[model samples]
Target: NPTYFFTFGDSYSQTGFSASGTQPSASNPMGNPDLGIGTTTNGPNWIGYLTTTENASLVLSYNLAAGGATIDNALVPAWPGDLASQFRLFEDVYADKPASAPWSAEDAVFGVWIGINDIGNAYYSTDAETYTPKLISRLESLVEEVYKNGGRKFLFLNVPPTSRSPLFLEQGEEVVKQHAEYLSVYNENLEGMVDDFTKKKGDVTTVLYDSWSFMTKILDDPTAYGFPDATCINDDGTSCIWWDNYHPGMKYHLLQAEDMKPKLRKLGGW
Candidate 1:
């Protein structure tokens, strides 16, 4: 009785697919069977919204998602990459299926997790101040993409505070904090973006899971959520959280789930 998890874009969703290592597994070891894993507490990590989406019959998960999606290249509004090619693949998969292939709304969950790649790319390559807004525009296009595709239930997980990730940590607190502030503006727009979308596109089941809050919770208060006291930027401002200064540890993901639970409940109608 599982509902479908239609994933889209980026490394976050590619949890289990990341080299089969434990640093950042796609399924959360602590997550319940909602993600098809038992309570052994060391299974793959699920980046989906599961704390509230615990009902198996209400959820089915799939990872049609890719790792490096950009705003222009996203299948919808997230990012860019062989989208046409990806769709060709999808068409190929459903090519011989019956007209009544039994794809129901309750059985489909669209999880859009793209666009960070664009931001990261921008950071890694250029100094684009308007890049954040560009992401919004791309995200809008994605909304249209999802809606046009009959996405009755679309969940847009907000960006985690970019500054808090290992990426910015490596730049030292001052530099990372500044870049984070810029990203904060972009992510802040996410709140308004979801609000505006709801207002404009009435009755489109779109939900916003605040990953920013989840992320900053740690940067704001590490011990409060649970981090190895020895973890984080060292006295010299070097850290392991940014495994490469881009990804996060399990500690961050766990806290994210905790913060996102209520938001998911309220937005997803749990």
Candidate 2:
């Protein structure tokens, strides 16, 4: 049976997939504007890599991520396409499991990789501590929404170490340190939430990919990852880990997919 992958998040996971656009098939997997189009990666993002290059079997992907998405717009203003909106899109367009992409609970996986913009936008707020818990609570509710819709296997990628990104670095050491602290808090809370959710939903399988540690490894030793250094932002995509000040290059996404393969396979996603 083919595995159907439904992805949600911000620009880091967006692939310009639209329900009204071309649909996936044996001839074309990531059907839409095109693979890599509207992606910040400058090439196929992790979802594309997982569907095409690192799959255990044929995979059909439905990516509803939008650029600058946060868990909730009321908390931290986001592009009109927030996580809630994405969920609504999924319900409106694909929840019926149409003939075009027939997916069963046993063969489908839901993945979410958000929070970069959430923390980036609100870490400095006076209510940062209070805000993060609410943000995570909202995340849990969204996942529960998917679970209610028969999504049993779930993958959550924690926020990366964006404090090391060129954009944060340029803001100075103080800003970088501050951002890192909030990211650490957010990741810890996310991990805790995953554990709690799994215990609460006995039949569900959850995988929280430690994207923070993975990206930190690359940043600490860029050369090991085929980059000249961690700080260089390049548009060529191959020369550096970052495509621009904030987005990761294509190579990074490829490596991320490769690293995530084993974890995904455990959930029978790969």
Q: TM-score for every candidate vs. truth?
A: 0.69, 0.97
| True-structure lDDT of candidate 2 | 0.88
- lDDT (CA) per prediction: 0.50, 0.88
| Model 1 weakest 10-residue run by lDDT | 16-25
lDDT of 1: 0.50
Score residue 43 of candidate 1 by CA lDDT.
24
* Regions of model 1 farther than 4 Å from truth: 15-43, 48-58, 73-101, 123-129, 230-244, 266-270
lDDT by residue for model 1 over 1-270, one digit each (tens)? Answer: 434455555555553222122211124321223442321122223354352233322443344445555656532334344233333433454223323223444444566755565555555444445566666765766566555655566678776766656555567888766666666666667667778887787766667877776566566766665445423533212232333346564444445555555555533423
Model 2 misplacement above 4 A: none
> Judged by TM-score, which candidate is best?
2
Cα lDDT of model 2 by residue, 58-106, tens digit: 8888899999899989778879999989998988888778898788778
Would you list the clashing residue pairs of candidate 2? Answer: none
